[PDB]
Amino acid sequence: SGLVKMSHPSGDVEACMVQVTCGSMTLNGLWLDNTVWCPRHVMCPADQLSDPNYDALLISMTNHSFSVQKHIGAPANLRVVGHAMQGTLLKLTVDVANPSTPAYTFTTVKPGAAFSVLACYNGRPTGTFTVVMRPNYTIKGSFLCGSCGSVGYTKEGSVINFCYMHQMELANGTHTGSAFDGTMYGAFMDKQVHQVQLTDKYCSVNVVAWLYAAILNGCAWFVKPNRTSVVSFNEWALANQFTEFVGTQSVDMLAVKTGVAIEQLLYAIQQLYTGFQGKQILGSTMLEDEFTPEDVNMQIMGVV
Amino acid sequence: SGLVKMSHPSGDVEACMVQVTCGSMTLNGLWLDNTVWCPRHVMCPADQLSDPNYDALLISMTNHSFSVQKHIGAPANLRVVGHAMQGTLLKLTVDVANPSTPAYTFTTVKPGAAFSVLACYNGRPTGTFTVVMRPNYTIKGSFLCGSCGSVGYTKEGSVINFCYMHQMELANGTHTGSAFDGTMYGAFMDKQVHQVQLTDKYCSVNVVAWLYAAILNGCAWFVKPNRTSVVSFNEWALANQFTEFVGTQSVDMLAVKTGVAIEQLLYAIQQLYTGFQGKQILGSTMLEDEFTPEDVNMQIMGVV
Secondary structure, three states, rough: OOOOOOOOHHHHHHHOEEEEEOEEEEEEEEEOOEEEEHHHHHHHOOOOOOOHHHHHHHHOOOHHHHEEOOOOOOOOOOOOEEEEEOOOOEEEEEOOOOOOOOOOOEEOOOOOOOEEEEEOOOOEEEEEEEEOOOOOOOOOOOOOOOOOOEEEEEOOEEEEEEEEEEEEEEEOOOOEEEEOOOEEEHHOOOOOOOOOOOOOOHHHHHHHHHHHHHHHOOOOOOOOOOOOOHHHHHHHHHHOOOOOOOOOOOHOOOHHOOOOOHHHHHHHHHOOOOOOOOOOOOOOOOOOOOOOOOHHHHHHHHHO | OOOOOOOOOOOOOOEEEEEEEEEEEEEEEEEEEOOOEEEHHOOOOOOOOOOOHHHHHHHHHHHEEEEEOOOOOOEEEEEEEEEEEEOOEEEEEEEEOOOOOEOOOOOOOOOOEEEEEEEEEOOOEEEEEEEEEEOOOOOOOOOOOOOOOOOOEEEEEEOOOOOOOOEEEOOOOEEEOOOOOOOHHHOOOOOOOOOOOOOOOOOOHHHHHHHHHHHHEEEEEEEOOOOOOOHHHHHHHHHEEEEEOOOOOOHHHHHHOOOHHHHHHHHHHHHOOOOOOOEEEEOOOOOOOOHHHHHHHHHHHHHO
């Protein structure tokens, strides 16, 4: 038992991390097959970061403009034999295939979904943590200068699904990055200008999962017969900084196991959101929304 | 910026994980040099887990009684050529040295200290997370049947300091394990009998670090001129389920950087522990105590 912020083991992804240098900029890249992915702002002069012209920067580059170094294991320089731009990423082609390329896919995560991040500096992994894509298309991470190109991923068995490449800090503790089609989460521009974000909201389905997690761990004082329907809750949610609730089979599995209906927990939320008035739930005194139904099923019931 | 639950990259330790089987029990082991460490309850018959006689079980074993399998990378069976007991661990000697043995040490962590855990099942890493050794010598982890032998570690540069091998669940979400001298944290016995724990307490020095972290991230409403001395706070702490505060250079670095005295934050705690009365600190409405001064210095100020 117990529910904690859990990340995937990072070794498979560590073996794919490299350093990319262009001009007066160095950051991290992802080496899969003969391709190295990295943020395109590696091209920008380090003092021209407000409104860059990336199309103009690209045409001014040649293969010689890039250097790719692997540090992990034993050092190797990876010769660049092609360069292309895809949205806010560069795709560099190198003359050697990564012999440690995992089985992988690319995916785009939606608000409420969790993924692991491997934070890297100068091509060297330094830490890993798990985040949830927020309803305003940011993540609440921990990133400093040097961290761009750090990657986020989920896994399906042994298959790694790469879903995030780190690009920027929008406000204190508030971050975003690219999917591997080169689109920025939240459509934020990769330049240093003021960019407003939507307000953050509670991820209702994750709150419901965490309440089920609390029940499964001996904590159920908040459960009453009273019910709020999904449709009624969702109208309320929009008025009160909660996401609309969408049920899944993963949530249903928790309702069956506990015998507590989703609707009982929707009512509870509506009583609990102004505060627990002295009480605690799994050691917290506010609603927790970064544990997904899949996370709860995996950690507590051992189901994947 | 941003402060999150951060773990070390786990790849170096993944390469040391193996499966150990004895009798009707299988669990995880740690392979360093020619040694494989694992919990000694792998010896116990799966239906004799209340009061085992480990001395008697040991003498009934031979090298043939153990099988060690590596799954990571390409499978290998590691021939056992010696067995010994050290407290609540077995030390198995195998006929091949792990070619991926990291630079390492063994250490024993103290209450308030954080470390990374690599959770493993059947010799296969499944997740990683960070915990803090609690004041009652337990950790708040996430572990199921099959997880024993999972390891915890800190790092000093490239050196891995192994400090925890998982052994048992004491209560819901409440765990303990061995240091590598074979002593159990909290002196809990490796048998299935009722074992009382001391009450948990807030780790005051980590609360202070987190408040400094809040200041560094634009959150400082709780700072006032009022001060409480360390000696006065510590008398109070013992009456109110807080640890006694012990300053360190790591904390001093935070006080200098922010210009806020430790004593101002000790006063704040004394006002905040009954609740924040509607307010929040870095998205929390209760005191957070699992971020250490070193963690805050590393994540926010980039200092190690």
